[PDB]
Scaffold this active site. Structure first.
Site, PDB file in Angstrom:
ATOM      1  N   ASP A   1      -0.214  -4.489   5.478  1.00  0.00           N
ATOM      2  CA  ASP A   1      -0.987  -3.913   6.563  1.00  0.00           C
ATOM      3  C   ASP A   1      -2.454  -4.141   6.254  1.00  0.00           C
ATOM      4  O   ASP A   1      -2.874  -4.037   5.100  1.00  0.00           O
ATOM      5  CB  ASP A   1      -0.700  -2.419   6.745  1.00  0.00           C
TER       6      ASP A   1
ATOM      7  N   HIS B   1       6.854  -6.065  11.140  1.00  0.00           N
ATOM      8  CA  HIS B   1       6.087  -4.816  11.241  1.00  0.00           C
ATOM      9  C   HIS B   1       5.422  -4.651  12.612  1.00  0.00           C
ATOM     10  O   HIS B   1       4.197  -4.623  12.738  1.00  0.00           O
ATOM     11  CB  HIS B   1       5.051  -4.738  10.112  1.00  0.00           C
ATOM     12  CG  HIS B   1       4.518  -3.362   9.858  1.00  0.00           C
ATOM     13  ND1 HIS B   1       3.558  -2.778  10.653  1.00  0.00           N
ATOM     14  CD2 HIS B   1       4.796  -2.465   8.883  1.00  0.00           C
ATOM     15  CE1 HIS B   1       3.274  -1.575  10.187  1.00  0.00           C
ATOM     16  NE2 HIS B   1       4.012  -1.361   9.113  1.00  0.00           N
TER      17      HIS B   1
ATOM     18  N   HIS C   1       0.849  -1.182   0.000  1.00  0.00           N
ATOM     19  CA  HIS C   1       0.000   0.000   0.000  1.00  0.00           C
ATOM     20  C   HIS C   1       0.888   1.237   0.000  1.00  0.00           C
ATOM     21  O   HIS C   1       2.117   1.144   0.035  1.00  0.00           O
ATOM     22  CB  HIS C   1      -0.975  -0.007   1.182  1.00  0.00           C
ATOM     23  CG  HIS C   1      -0.317  -0.030   2.525  1.00  0.00           C
ATOM     24  ND1 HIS C   1       0.516  -1.049   2.932  1.00  0.00           N
ATOM     25  CD2 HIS C   1      -0.391   0.832   3.565  1.00  0.00           C
ATOM     26  CE1 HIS C   1       0.937  -0.807   4.158  1.00  0.00           C
ATOM     27  NE2 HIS C   1       0.401   0.328   4.567  1.00  0.00           N
TER      28      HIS C   1
ATOM     29  N   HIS D   1       6.118   1.467   3.622  1.00  0.00           N
ATOM     30  CA  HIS D   1       6.077   0.353   2.684  1.00  0.00           C
ATOM     31  C   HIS D   1       6.438   0.727   1.255  1.00  0.00           C
ATOM     32  O   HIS D   1       6.787  -0.169   0.479  1.00  0.00           O
ATOM     33  CB  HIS D   1       4.686  -0.301   2.670  1.00  0.00           C
ATOM     34  CG  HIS D   1       4.295  -0.932   3.968  1.00  0.00           C
ATOM     35  ND1 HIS D   1       4.142  -2.292   4.116  1.00  0.00           N
ATOM     36  CD2 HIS D   1       4.024  -0.390   5.177  1.00  0.00           C
ATOM     37  CE1 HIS D   1       3.790  -2.561   5.360  1.00  0.00           C
ATOM     38  NE2 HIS D   1       3.713  -1.424   6.025  1.00  0.00           N
TER      39      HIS D   1
ATOM     40  N   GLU E   1       1.826  -8.732   9.640  1.00  0.00           N
ATOM     41  CA  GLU E   1       2.190  -7.703  10.598  1.00  0.00           C
ATOM     42  C   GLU E   1       1.787  -8.133  12.002  1.00  0.00           C
ATOM     43  O   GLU E   1       0.842  -8.903  12.195  1.00  0.00           O
ATOM     44  CB  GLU E   1       1.531  -6.369  10.238  1.00  0.00           C
ATOM     45  CG  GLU E   1       2.053  -5.745   8.954  1.00  0.00           C
ATOM     46  CD  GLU E   1       1.326  -4.463   8.594  1.00  0.00           C
ATOM     47  OE1 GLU E   1       0.297  -4.161   9.233  1.00  0.00           O
ATOM     48  OE2 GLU E   1       1.783  -3.759   7.668  1.00  0.00           O
TER      49      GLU E   1
HETATM   50 ZN   LIG Z   1       0.070   0.761   6.799  1.00  0.00          ZN
HETATM   51 ZN   LIG Z   2       2.941   0.035   7.631  1.00  0.00          ZN
END
Ligand SMILES: [Zn+2]
Ligand SMILES: [Zn+2]
Lengths: 458, 94, 490, 550
Positions: A177, A375, A67, A72, A202
């Site tokens: 995410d 993450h 994203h 990222h 994550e």
């Molecule tokens: Zn994110």
């Molecule tokens: Zn992130």
């Protein structure tokens, strides 16, 4: 017959998402982000692990961007147009619209203000976006002759995507995410029963009550004649706040204005308007009545209507920085000086990522045979690893940055079965009947026929 | 477009008997058959008719009238059913 | 014109145009004696044609003619099972089983022909095609032997998911027709609840709910523990886990079936609304789902379970309060309606009350009316809360004067059911100075009738202090008794 | 294996593919050409259509009305369904839907036939065909006529009828228009899919929708079951249209290629027809006349609105209003705006900028194109006499186009311009026939013509080809052009309506997976190739086979 995973980025940290996966002899990088909070040239991930003065196009067959968040996707122009990469950069369609304008914003931040010597220009940002191949939801795109990737709706931000990387019978699902609870403008994460060999997820961590309390605070402050100055720092939080506000203002049917500022939130509004299919069920279903992102109450702020007197709602550009501190100083010591950070100060926080139970649900519903954690914070990763290895009885891993993790896999041989023998096996045994046959292990193909077909075609 | 709201009381089969008649000031007496989808039934012996009847004619030198009337049809002829109601109509030239 | 059919089928062509003629013939009704004649002719012509599509059309037309009204199908079953005896095409066999199912459904009284048909189904269940097995399972489900339960339970574990769904729906049809099921069904459906296919999971959760309703008080052991759990509680846990399914219609089905498990113990009921075994947080997850249908179904499940269990309603209360502000109007209508339904004896404290009174300000008339009937059916202590309710109702009346009849009904029900709490509030509502002669308030002013409707209905059940009225309030009492007699009492 | 053909229409097919242990319906097509035999449904009771003279048969005069020598049925326009009785529709498992034009009659299969399976189509086909179904139901149910005429659908009487009514086929299967709750129930059971998305059906076959290029969201389908593939090529475009270009690479090495939806009247250049449409529109509005364009709310109207947007500034026709009257007009425009991910690389590069993808959106903000839900609401207050109206159904039997032709057909300055090739132009004008209006027939069919499909079949090389019978023959309008047919090295396989095709492309070698426990136990004996004798127990689950060591 092994899957080797080396996170050169996050590992046991937050920010700078960059995970290398070497499944079945093909190397895929899973994000390419920058670490905010570092200014000592550790923003971009250490790509010296892959090649030291070597061509990255040969080494990497695919680059995936989950994203448009800068942790990222922020290191992508550097990684492409400075180190050297002219391969396929796979990205989601709303991500490919938001990523240039957030990269340019951080390019505006880093080059003008806060210490960027080795950085990227706008021209190479456009050059990096020229190499980006956009993919749709659930579209199986063939990057190679046998390596295919597939995007799944993650629901973290607009166009946030979970990617399944399948080559042969071995698959790796990477969830950059995501949030398993729907927002007011986004849906929840969804994955089918892939049963992958590895789930890279994550690991960093009520809502209706918080939204009702925030709306009650805003309504009580605006009905007293005062003006609120709620700031926004992320695009997803800004769009969620605007849509929740707009449906509240339409429901209560009061006409005192709400305003949003900056030349970037307007671009985010336009892109969210153009990407209705990547939104929540309500926005898609009631789109035929009206576009919910075409706000009938939230209008553009010409310096918040030149800071005119009266009750009004103002959105600040940062979450500090310019275009918010002037409003904060101009409204301090007023009737209702309600400023709600994520001189009355309120605290209303909206979670953009998944919590522990959401990660547990995703692991349960995707059902992998191994889980890998990135993450997030190391203590939270240890607690969640304990929860994964206790409740679902499935292996969890703790990789740091630069720490490779290898996994043994058992491939299954694809063999053709002669249809007569298969129908014979369907005939007898359906009433533990053994199947005796001959395996003609020819070159580049395998056939398993009966002994009669073996002797007649020997 | 002209919207009507009929309070049909004690009609056995309003789906296939109640008809809307529009009568223009000339000899035109267009008879409109309402669909069964908008014969609402809010009670026993009570029915509600909500149709958007459609009216058109060429230019008038003055807004005359139009005559809207409900009719009851039977298996061969039709008889008056409701109170005659006049609506003003002004077709202006293009 | 049966002889015309015979001539046209056996005289024009064999392969292709015979199919066209059968298709043309299939669109007209046939009288019952002519049904018998054409059945004999078509079954004679069945053996002649070796084309499978023509035989499939023949089987479909036999199934259609067997469904005619005045024709008794008892004389054609033997030729039907004879042509099933030597039929090799699987599609034609499936159509023939469909015809036999029509024959069996048209004659429910004859037990011998039903036993013959279920014998044929049990014979043909071992077919390699999934369609034949599906039709045979449908035949067993529609007729049965009300042995059949054991066979369908064996076919729960077939490789094809369509046959698994056919078996579950067949045994559900067996239960629906009247047959009482076993208990090993529960273990088999529990194993099948984790199927990789949507339809199998939906059918399995339906079967789990049925077998839970049949034997609620049965005791089953935990597979991983020594403790023993009631069957309805265990199945409640399984359906609560199915509430978190990946398919939204499966979630809707799970919530709807979860609403009908009224025999569940209280412990799992407090478990299902908590946020901290598998039943924990099921309704919390269902009330925040992305699909509004799942949220609606969870709302009715909450309503049914709180109507069953009075202790559950207090836990339902705050979730309904939180979900009054929902993005879909039908969802909040349902939440307000079910809140009215479960407000039998529980009292509202301050924050829930003024959240209700805050959402009273909404521009939609429908949820305003629904919330008005909720305020009609609500019970509340702390008479300052009643004063707050009156203030919010009066400002709603000012903001929306069309709802004056509903607001007067609200104040009638509030006065009639909270009499002692309104009593100290009377000098604050009627502007009664302790010594000054107060001006007569303007009658036909909808705020003032709204106050008086609240006051007079409070004075009906409490004759302790009706002397707090002034003279003009008694005159207005006479006026409202003459005019609004359906609201103000004697 | 087998292929049932429930529709005889080339561009509106309904083919049921009985393939291995799964039954797939390839599209469902409502033949709306049956409505041409009926008298048109007007918004108001027009004097001309009401007192048309009846037509008599010496053997019905209230059922049949004759207009200018052509006999028309005075009932509601009925629709020729796909034939739903050859194969039991409860036995079909999956309906694959290509176009929104090929998603009509889905309420007929999904409700009246006991079909309990699932439906797959893309997002824009479902949304746009929802809009088209909505306006079809609205147009039938605005001023409800009755289904009074039934005697003419008799085998004894329809022989005696004149040629337009006698030639109508499967008349007894014609049905009234479905209602709105049937539309909602039909569209509730559609599972939404995207381009190049793998859908597994019971573990046996794998279907993916591939971009076709005809309409936005329109898709070709390939059905793969291990080592055999069936390619379904519905209406596709090889021209520079707005949607994503045709995916030709994924159709390769297919055993049988079912193709439908070729160009009607292939001897027409669509760019030349766009030029003719713009030239005739400019000529009419320059003379003070009126242009009526009977069109669908979506599809070719976007292309001709783009070209008219590029043409009005060049021709100086900025003072000529463009009116778009449809009950789903606003929804069609908004849906075209938000489906940018389904458009070609030129259009979806525009939404990377903060800019609408279609240029007709700028016509609303410049007020050049005004759209209205109906004639009555506020179009009757915003109407200027020299104007262009895009409205109505192109069948000319229902919708606002009927009222506009009854209004404008008495003047020779007004013109009607036909851009949809779906309906016969002469049969469309036949119930209005004594009209002074000039009628321009310039169809803008952008589907595959015969040279394009010859190049496509040379590129793909399918082992077998299945096409309608009309594609093997020359078109009856020409009946001599040998280039207007499908020609392949195998001489194709033609089908008609209610015909069952047997495909002898079934093969052996179903795929299996062997676990490594058995793989070690098999000794690779040298033959020269290799040989090994295996003894294992066969495990089958969800139509996928496994080999387990005993
Ligand atoms: Zn994110
Ligand atoms: Zn992130």
């Amino acid at each position: 017959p092994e899957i080797r995973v080396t996170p050169l980025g996050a590992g046991q940290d937050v920010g700078r998402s960059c995970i290398l996966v070497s499944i079945a002899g093909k190397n895929v990088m899973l994000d390419c982000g920058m670490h905010m909070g570092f200014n000592d040239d550790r923003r971009f991930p250490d790509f010296s692990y892959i090649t030291q003065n070597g061509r990255l196009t040969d080494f990497l067959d695919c680059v995936i961007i989950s994203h448009f968040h800068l942790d990222h996707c922020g290191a992508l122009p550097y990684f492409s147009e400075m180190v050297g990469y002219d391969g396929p950069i796979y990205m989601t369609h709303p991500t490919q619209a938001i990523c240039p304008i957030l990269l340019e914003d951080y390019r505006k931040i880093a080059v003008d203000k806060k210490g960027e010597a080795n950085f990227f220009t706008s021209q190479m940002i456009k050059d990096c976006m020229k190499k980006v191949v956009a993919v749709h939801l659930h579209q199986t795109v063939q990057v190679d002759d046998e390596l295919e990737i597939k995007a799944y709706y993650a629901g973290h931000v607009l166009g946030a995507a979970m990617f399944q990387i399948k080559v042969g019978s071995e698959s790796v699902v990477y969830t950059g995410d995501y949030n398993m609870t729907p927002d007011r403008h986004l849906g929840a994460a969804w994955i089918d029963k892939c049963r992958p060999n590895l789930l890279i997820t994550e690991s960093t961590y009520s809502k209706r009550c918080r939204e009702r309390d925030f709306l009650k605070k805003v309504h009580e402050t605006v009905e007293r004649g005062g003006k609120v100055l709620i700031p926004v720092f992320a695009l997803g939080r800004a769009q969620e706040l605007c849509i929740l506000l707009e449906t509240f203002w339409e429901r209560m049917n009061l006409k005192v204005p709400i305003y949003f500022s900056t030349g970037l939130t307007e671009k985010a509004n336009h892109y969210y308007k153009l990407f209705i299919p990547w939104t929540n069920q309500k926005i898609r279903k009631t789109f035929v009545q009206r576009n919910m992102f075409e706000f009938k109450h939230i209008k553009a702020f010409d310096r918040a209507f030149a800071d005119n007197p009266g009750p009004m709602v103002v959105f600040a550009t940062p979450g500090h920085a310019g275009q918010s501190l002037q409003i904060f100083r101009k409204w301090a010591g007023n009737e209702k000086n309600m400023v709600i950070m994520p001189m009355q100060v309120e605290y209303m926080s909206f979670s953009a990522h998944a919590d522990a139970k959401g990660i547990m649900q995703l692991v349960g519903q995707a059902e992998p045979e191994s889980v890998l954690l990135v993450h997030g914070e190391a203590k939270k990763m240890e607690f969640l690893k304990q929860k994964i290895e206790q409740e679902l009885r499935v292996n969890c891993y703790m990789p740091a940055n630069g720490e490779t993790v290898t996994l043994p896999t058992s491939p299954s041989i694809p063999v053709g079965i002669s249809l007569g023998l298969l129908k014979r096996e369907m005939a007898q045994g359906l009433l533990p009947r053994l199947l005796h046959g001959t395996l003609i292990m020819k070159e580049s193909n395998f056939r398993l026929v009966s002994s009669e077909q073996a002797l007649k075609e020997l | 477009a002209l919207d009507v709201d009929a309070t049909l009381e004690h009609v056995q089969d309003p789906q296939n008997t109640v008809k809307v008649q529009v009568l223009y000031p000339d000899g035109q007496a267009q008879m409109i058959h309402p669909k069964p989808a908008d014969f609402r039934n809010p009670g026993p012996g009570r029915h509600r008719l909500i149709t958007q009847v459609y009216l058109s004619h060429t230019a008038w030198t003055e807004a005359c009238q139009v005559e809207v009337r409900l009719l009851l049809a039977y298996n061969e002829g039709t008889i008056p059913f409701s109170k005659p109601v006049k609506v003003y109509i002004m077709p202006k030239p293009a | 014109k049966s002889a015309a059919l015979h001539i046209d089928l056996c005289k024009a062509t064999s392969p292709a145009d015979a199919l066209q003629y059968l298709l043309q013939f299939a669109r007209k009704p046939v009288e019952a004696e002519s049904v018998e004649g054409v059945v004999r002719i078509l079954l004679e012509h069945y053996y002649k044609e070796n084309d499978p599509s023509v035989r499939l059309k023949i089987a479909s037309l036999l199934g259609l003619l067997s469904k005619t009204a005045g024709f008794s199908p008892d004389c054609i079953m033997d030729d039907a099972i004879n042509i099933l005896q030597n039929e090799k095409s699987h599609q034609v066999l499936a159509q023939l089983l469909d015809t036999l199912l029509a024959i069996g459904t048209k004659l429910p009284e004859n037990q011998a022909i039903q036993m013959r048909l279920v014998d044929v189904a049990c014979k043909h269940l071992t077919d390699t095609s999934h369609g034949v097995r599906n039709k045979c399972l449908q035949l067993l489900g529609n007729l049965g032997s009300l042995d059949v339960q054991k066979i369908i339970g064996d076919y729960f574990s077939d490789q094809d998911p369509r046959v698994r769904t056919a078996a579950i729906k067949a045994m559900l049809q067996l239960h629906e027709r009247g047959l009482k099921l076993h208990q090993t069904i529960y273990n088999q459906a529990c194993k099948l609840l984790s199927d990789d296919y949507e339809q199998v999971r939906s059918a399995a959760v339906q079967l789990i709910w049925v077998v839970s309703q049949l034997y609620p008080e049965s005791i089953v052991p935990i597979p991983s523990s020594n403790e023993e759990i009631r069957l309805v509680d265990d199945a409640f846990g399984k359906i609560c886990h199915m509430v978190s399914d990946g398919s939204w219609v499966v979630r809707v089905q799970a919530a709807k079936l979860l609403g009908s498990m009224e025999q569940v113990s209280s412990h799992f009921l407090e478990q299902t609304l908590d946020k901290k075994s598998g039943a924990c947080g099921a309704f919390v997850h269902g009330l925040e789902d992305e699909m509004y249908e799942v949220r609606i179904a969870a709302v009715e499940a909450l309503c049914m379970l709180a109507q069953s269990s009075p202790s559950f309603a207090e836990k339902c209360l705050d979730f309904l309060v939180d979900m009054f502000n929902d993005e879909i109007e039908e969802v909040r209508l349902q939440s307000i309606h079910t809140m009215r339904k479960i407000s039998n004896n529980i009292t509202l404290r301050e924050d829930q009350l003024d959240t209700v009174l805050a959402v009273l300000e909404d521009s939609s008339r429908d949820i305003r009316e629904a919330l008005h009937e909720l305020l009609c059916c609500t019970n509340v202590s702390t008479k300052e809360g009643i004063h707050l309710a009156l203030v919010e109702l009066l400002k709603n009346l000012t903001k929306y004067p069309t709802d004056r009849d509903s607001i007067w009904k609200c104040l009638k029900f509030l006065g009639s059911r909270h009499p002692t709490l309104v009593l100290p509030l009377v000098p604050e509502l009627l502007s009664t100075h302790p010594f000054f002669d107060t001006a007569e308030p303007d009658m036909d002013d909808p705020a003032y009738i709204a106050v008086l409707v609240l006051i007079f209905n409070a004075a009906k059940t409490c004759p302790t202090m009706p002397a707090l009225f002034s003279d003009h309030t008694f005159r207005h009492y006479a006026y409202l008794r003459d005019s609004l007699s359906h609201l103000v009492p004697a | 294996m087998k292929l049932y053909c429930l529709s005889g229409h080339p561009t509106l097919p309904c083919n049921v593919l009985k393939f291995k242990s799964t039954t797939i319906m390839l599209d469902c097509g409502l033949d709306m050409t049956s409505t041409l035999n009926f008298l048109p449904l007007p918004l108001v009771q027009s004097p001309r259509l009401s007192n048309l003279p009846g037509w008599s048969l010496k053997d019905l005069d209230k059922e049949l009305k004759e207009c200018s020598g052509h006999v028309f049925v005075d009932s509601v326009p009925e629709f020729c369904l796909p034939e739903t009785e050859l194969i039991d529709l409860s036995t079909v498992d999956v309906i694959l839907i290509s176009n929104y034009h090929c998603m009509m009659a889905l309420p007929y299969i999904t409700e009246h036939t006991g079909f309990t399976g699932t439906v797959y189509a893309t997002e824009p086909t479902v949304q746009i065909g929802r809009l088209l179904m909505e306006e079809l139901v609205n147009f039938i149910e605005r001023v409800p006529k009755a289904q009074s005429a039934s005697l003419w659908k008799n085998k004894d009487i329809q022989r005696l009828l004149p040629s337009p009514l006698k030639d109508a086929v499967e008349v007894s299967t014609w049905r009234r228009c479905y209602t709105m709750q049937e539309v909602n129930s039909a569209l509730s059971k559609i599972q939404l899919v995207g381009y190049s998305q793998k859908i597994e059906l019971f573990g046996a076959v794998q279907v993916t929708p591939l971009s076709s290029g005809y309409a936005l969201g329109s898709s070709n389908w390939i059905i793969q079951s291990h080592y055999e593939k069936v390619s379904y090529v519905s209406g596709s475009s090889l021209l520079t249209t707005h949607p994503q270009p045709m995916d030709q690479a994924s159709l390769k090495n297919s055993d049988v290629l079912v193709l439908t939806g070729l160009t009607q009247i292939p001897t027409a250049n669509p760019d030349g027809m766009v030029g003719e449409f713009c030239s005739n529109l400019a000529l009419t509005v320059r003379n003070g006349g009126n242009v009526l364009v009977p069109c669908y709310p979506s599809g070719v109207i976007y292309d001709l609105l783009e070209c008219l947007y590029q043409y009005i500034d060049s021709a100086g026709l900025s003072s000529v209003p463009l009116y778009f009257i449809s009950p789903v007009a606003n929804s069609s425009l908004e849906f075209s705006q938000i489906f940018a991910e389904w458009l070609c690389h030129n259009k979806q590069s525009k939404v990377y900028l903060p800019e609408p993808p279609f240029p007709h959106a700028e016509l609303i903000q410049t007020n050049k194109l005004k759209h209205y839900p109906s004639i009555h609401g506020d179009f009757s207050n915003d109407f200027r006499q020299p104007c262009v109206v895009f409205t109505g159904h192109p069948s000319l039997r229902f919708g606002d186009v009927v009222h506009f032709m009854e209004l404008w057909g008495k003047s020779s300055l007004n013109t009607v311009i036909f851009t949809e090739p779906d309906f016969s132009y002469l049969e469309a004008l036949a119930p209005y026939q004594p009209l002074a209006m000039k009628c321009i027939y310039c169809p803008i069919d952008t589907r595959l013509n015969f040279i394009q499909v010859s190049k496509l079949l040379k590129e793909v090389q399918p082992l077998h080809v299945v096409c309608p019978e009309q594609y093997t023959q020359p078109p009856p309008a020409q009946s001599h052009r040998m280039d207007l047919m499908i020609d392949c090295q195998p001489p194709a396989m033609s089908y008609r309506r209610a015909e069952v095709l047997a495909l002898p492309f079934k093969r052996r070698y179903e795929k299996i997976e062997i676990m490594p426990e058995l793989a070690d136990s098999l000794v690779p004996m040298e033959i020269k190739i290799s040989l090994a004798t295996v003894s294992a127990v066969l495990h089958t689950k969800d139509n996928k086979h496994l080999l387990q060591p005993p």
